[PDB]
Design a protein around this nucleic acid. Structure first.
Lengths: 198, 258, 180
RNA sequence: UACCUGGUUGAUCCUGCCAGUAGCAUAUGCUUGUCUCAAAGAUUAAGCCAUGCACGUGUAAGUACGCACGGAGUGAAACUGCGAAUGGCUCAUUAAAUCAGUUAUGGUUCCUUUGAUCACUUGGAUAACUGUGGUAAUUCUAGAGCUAAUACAUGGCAUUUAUCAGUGGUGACUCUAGAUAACCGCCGAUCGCACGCACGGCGACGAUACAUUCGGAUGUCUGCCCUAUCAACUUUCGAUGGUACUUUCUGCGCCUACCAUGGUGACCACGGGUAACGGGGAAUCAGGGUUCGAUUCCGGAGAGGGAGCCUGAGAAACGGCUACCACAUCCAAGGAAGGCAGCAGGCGCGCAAAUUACCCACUCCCGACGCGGGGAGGUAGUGACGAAAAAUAACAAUUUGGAAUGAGUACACUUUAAAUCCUUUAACGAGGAUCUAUUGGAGGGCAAGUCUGGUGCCAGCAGCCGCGGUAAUUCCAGCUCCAAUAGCGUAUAUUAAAGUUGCUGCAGUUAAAAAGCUCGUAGUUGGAUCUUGUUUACUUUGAAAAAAUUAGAGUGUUCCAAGCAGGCCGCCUGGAUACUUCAGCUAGGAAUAAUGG
RNA sequence: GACCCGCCGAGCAGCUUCCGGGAAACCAAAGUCUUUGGGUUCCGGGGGGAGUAUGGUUGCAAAGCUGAAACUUAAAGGAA
RNA sequence: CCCGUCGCUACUACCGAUUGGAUGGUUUAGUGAGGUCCUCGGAUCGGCGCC
């Protein structure tokens, strides 16, 4: 099958090398995962040494983290928007490492309101609890949080659309998980300019 | 070539085993264990070739299977157990206790010890790591993992454990002025006082050892096994501790004893 | 893979000039003088001494106080004075080069049992040894090329089972006795 | 032992080769009494294979309702577990590849061993077994009836990212730990013994985020023969580098996408050849070398040719599968089964290479294991590959005599798993001691006949020069002599000889030879000078360089080649040392030769 | 300036010598060479086959440059 | 003493029409068994129409 050896290439000088042995098993290669967006389908691959690799064939949810704050919630992957490798994987919606995609921005806003007591993606009985009644000693705790609860202008306009720019830091084809971090700061301004031109 | 090798030729056997040629084609391959293949003495060779307690490999198995032999206090029934350096071979049936220590020729000599001894053994620390929940661990030269060691014990010192409990009783720090037995070839079995340690970053640290008679010689840090604090060894040394008489001096001592 | 050695060695060297009359008469002079079988035994003793002189040549080129010359030099001298070839008065490597082929031929077993009066001739000696009559300190030695050393020279005698020694006479004497 | 001799001429001194000479290793010829060892279908065919065998495995401790044997137990069979990835064989491929030294994984995976760490006694299937069957045929299997589990299934860490701080570290962590936000296997339904006080001891088995061992995998530095009638090569479709993945046990154009246009080479790239596996080594050698290394040790590779996989810790496995290719077997013609470069054996190929033997007793290996298995191995048979020891007479009288013995032979012992052999030893066994030593030579080189008979430039001899044309010292023979000797010739390759391949160390006026001449890059080599009275090269020291082989210490294997054992009247001694180029590492020297301020 | 008498450097040569070398003829270099090493390029390996075959390259051509093997031979040759 | 042509016999390579022939190795472009992976497929049978 697929071989990851280095004796099938040429030499540094440019000359070809003749193989002295056939293809070995410790230098094999396996087909790509091609992790699409959809219901969770994982295939465990027994690898060298009796270990197991989890090859994600399609994933819809991912454990993404927020950089500025400390909020790591399992959100839903919506759609990919940019890829540094090639524009063909975003056309097929393939989940790979360092792939910019839109994630469900509900858990990140739900935590922001339940912790800082301030509307984030606002332009219902659940929002009535946001203005909860409690002791004044507890209210003073949430009052000092609002003095440092100001979010970046580039992120507040993304909570309105319910979609946050994220970046996959894991390897779906190796561990079967599409975890990552929320794209923000200077990294966001870079990819927003790339998607805008594209 | 497809996996692990399970045989060992007599010509490829370690030289310090002192195996002949015309007895057989294969040599006893020591099973996996605390000590390396090239740096051990399998139990079949020690009972048959050294102690002459058995004449064939089958007679060796008749002794080990009766649970008469204890390496470091624990009974071993495998006739190919490594049983390397500093290991205690106690035989309660004959009331004999041994401790494998090299001689001036670099070979495991028959070193009989006392019943007051054979309860402890010296071990050289090779790796120190911090396990889970902030628990420091230890790696001796015979694959003995020790939890909660003294914080002063480092990656080259020598500890003293008790064969009944496996707990560290005492330890000897590695510094200039302590005894050591070289265990790395061309000085294997020589005992002297450490005098200088050359530190080579990214390479092997070369130390300089001086015998009791004044003979100086250098070796590598991985071959040093601290024996005692100062010049008093914490173990019983065999005849000819580490002097390594020259070929001219060994001839004189040979014919003078006639 | 077998439990064998295959470690052999030739104990002689054929001379370069095959038909030189100066050497052919010299070697034959040593065969008749010491009762040898052929020229190979002459070339054998010649090859042993040629290896001893080469060992002394390698040591004499070294320094006088070289540890290899002092150790292997005394070991070479001890083995020469042990077999009676070299004298105890000459314990220096310079006298090894002065040795000759006859010094080693005089130390062979058939030469000793002839000088000790056990045999009437040097050719009677080889047949006397090959017929299991000569013993060395309670060991029946059957090889005429048995190089006798000093401590084994005073113990050469007839075997305890020889008709010449204290033993039953041979089959010829026993058959000629039962006739008459 | 740092060695030469014949041959060109009428003669001479030369150049020079031919031939002689001595090892070696294959074949072969003749001959061959004993004994210690011992190579042995590699060379041409990695050609093809009848048949037999070479991998199997059970403890008090996974599963025992086969009376199969039995007062529970002992067991077939079978399930489960493990091994079958080692060994053995071959040298086809392969020329910076393999391999060797060095070394890196802080870029990794590792069954096992070792030390750490750790009740609702549940559910329903199945083999053996019972029974019914099919096919010409297979170690083919179908259907039904049962019944077990250490089989199957049920009943805070680890795993994946993000943030913060800086317990033990290293020359150097994005290290080991810790604290947060989350994300989403492991935490014992097992077995034996001992039986004591609801609690209890000793084990077996089993878990791995760990260590450890056996080691894999891929890198670092340096090192390979011949070839220029191979001078430029690589780069579509990766060549070189960058970025992000994907993939793998991980690093890496390993792969993909987007960019960059690189990378290599007269210091010989690329291409071609190798009757090329590499090395440890072997032969031959004053020094220097030349040649060899299929071949018992290490590493690699392959199992007719490729390719693709299963299982497993480990295989791109072939005494495992699935294809195609080559070849070939049984058929009832529907189908089925094949891989000897495993041990013997057979065919073929050839100049060229052995028994279809015996045992697991030794050496070790595997397995549940003290108990089983092993064409691994050992043993014997064949064996003038080769190496060691060593008979074929000795003595005395004058041709004649008594002595002495091994060959041979056996009552037996010993030897060994059982034997054989050797050794030990009764009996017996030598005068033509017929118990018969041959193999090549007798012109020279080259040790040995002006001998006799025959042949008559014939037949033949002759490595070379030559001999033979009727008295041949050379041929065919008798006699005699010489050389080595249980060995001695022949053919071929190879080494010394060859200072006739040259570094040591040759030659080029006329013997073979200096370009017609000059310029010129690389290459090679370069004045003197700096303390006398940074970068390297070099030298010295230490570590390393696996054993076996070689050198060599000790030791009466009867001696010896060998072996590593063996002394002493339990007892004390060995199982040394030296060498291992080059590169790399280390510590001194600072002349010589470069380089820098 | 011409000539005469010397010296120095450069060069074409000559001769006498037992400098030494060489197989010798001969050579002040063809010496300093078994007492063998200043530096460096090209080049020879018995005589034939043969500067032939083939391949490449150069040229309008003639030919130049590079350049074998099978096979054959015990001499070919130098100086005297 | 000796050279060459010619003639005779033998041997060895050389040139040579024959789109000569036979193997081996690199490959361009087609066809492509077999396994693996992925996307589907759901013959079947176990539990409670769904799993």
């Amino acid at each position: 099958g697929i071989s990851r050896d280095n004796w099938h290439k040429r030499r540094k000088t440019g000359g070809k090398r003749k193989p002295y042995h056939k293809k070995r098993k410790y230098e094999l290669g396996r087909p790509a995962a091609n992790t699409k967006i959809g219901p969770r389908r994982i295939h465990t691959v027994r690898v060298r040494g009796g270990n197991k690799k989890y090859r994600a064939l399609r994933l819809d949810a991912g454990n993404f983290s927020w950089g500025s704050e400390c909020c790591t919630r399992k959100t839903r992957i919506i759609d990919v928007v940019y890829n540094a490798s090639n524009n063909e994987l975003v056309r097929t919606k393939t989940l790979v490492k360092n792939c910019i995609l839109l994630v469900d921005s509900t858990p990140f806003r739900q935590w922001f309101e339940a912790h800082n007591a301030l509307p984030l993606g606002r332009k219902p009985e659940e929002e009535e609890i946001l203005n909860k009644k409690r002791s004044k000693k507890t209210q003073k705790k949430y009052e000092e949080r609002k003095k440092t609860a100001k979010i970046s202008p580039l992120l507040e306009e993304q909570f309105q659309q319910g979609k946050l720019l994220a970046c996959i830091a894991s390897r779906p084809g190796q561990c079967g998980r599409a975890d990552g971090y929320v794209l923000e700061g200077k990294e966001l301004e870079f990819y927003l300019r790339k998607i805008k031109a594209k | 070539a497809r996996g692990p090798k399970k045989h060992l030729k007599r010509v490829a056997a370690p030289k310090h085993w002192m195996l002949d040629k015309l007895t057989g084609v294969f040599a006893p391959r020591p099973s996996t264990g605390p000590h390396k293949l090239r740096e051990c003495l399998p139990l079949i060779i020690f009972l048959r070739n050294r102690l002459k307690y058995a004449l064939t490999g089958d007679e060796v198995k008749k002794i080990c299977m009766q649970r008469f032999i204890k390496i470091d206090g624990k009974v071993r029934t495998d006739i190919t157990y490594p049983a390397g350096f500093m290991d205690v071979i106690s035989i309660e049936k004959t009331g004999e206790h041994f401790r494998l220590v090299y001689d001036t020729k670099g070979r495991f000599a028959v070193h009989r010890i006392t019943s007051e001894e054979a309860k402890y053994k010296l071990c050289k620390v090779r790796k120190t790591w911090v396990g889970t929940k902030g628990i420091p661990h230890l790696v001796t030269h015979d694959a003995r993992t020790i939890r909660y060691p003294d914080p002063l014990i480092k990656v080259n010192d020598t500890i003293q454990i008790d064969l009944e409990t496996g707990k560290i009783t005492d330890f000897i720090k590695f510094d200039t002025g302590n005894l050591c037995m070289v265990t790395g070839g061309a000085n294997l079995g020589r005992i002297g006082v450490i005098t200088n340690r050359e530190r080579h970053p990214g390479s092997f640290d070369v130390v300089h050892v001086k015998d009791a008679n004044g003979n100086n010689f250098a070796t590598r840090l991985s071959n040093i096994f601290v024996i005692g604090k100062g010049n008093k060894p914490w173990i019983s040394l065999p005849r000819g501790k580490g002097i390594r008489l020259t070929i001219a001096e060994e001839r004189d001592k040979r014919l003078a004893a006639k | 893979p077998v439990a064998r050695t295959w470690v052999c060695r030739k104990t002689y060297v054929t001379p370069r000039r095959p038909f030189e009359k100066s050497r052919l008469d010299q070697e034959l002079k040593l065969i008749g003088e010491y009762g040898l079988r052929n020229k190979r035994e002459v070339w054998r003793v010649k090859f042993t001494l040629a290896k001893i002189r080469k060992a002394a040549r390698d040591l004499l080129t070294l320094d006088e106080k070289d540890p290899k010359r002092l150790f292997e030099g005394n070991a070479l001298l001890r083995r020469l004075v042990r077999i009676g070839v070299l004298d105890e008065g000459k314990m220096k490597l310079d006298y090894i080069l002065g040795l000759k082929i006859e010094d080693f031929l005089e130390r062979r077993l058939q030469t000793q049992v002839f000088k000790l009066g056990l045999a009437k001739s040097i050719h009677h000696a080889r047949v006397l040894i090959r017929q299991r009559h000569i013993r060395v300190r309670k060991q029946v030695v059957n090889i005429p090329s048995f190089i006798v050393r000093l401590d084994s020279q005073k113990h050469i005698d007839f075997s305890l089972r020889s008709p010449y020694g204290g033993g039953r006479p041979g089959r010829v004497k026993r058959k000629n006795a039962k006739k008459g």
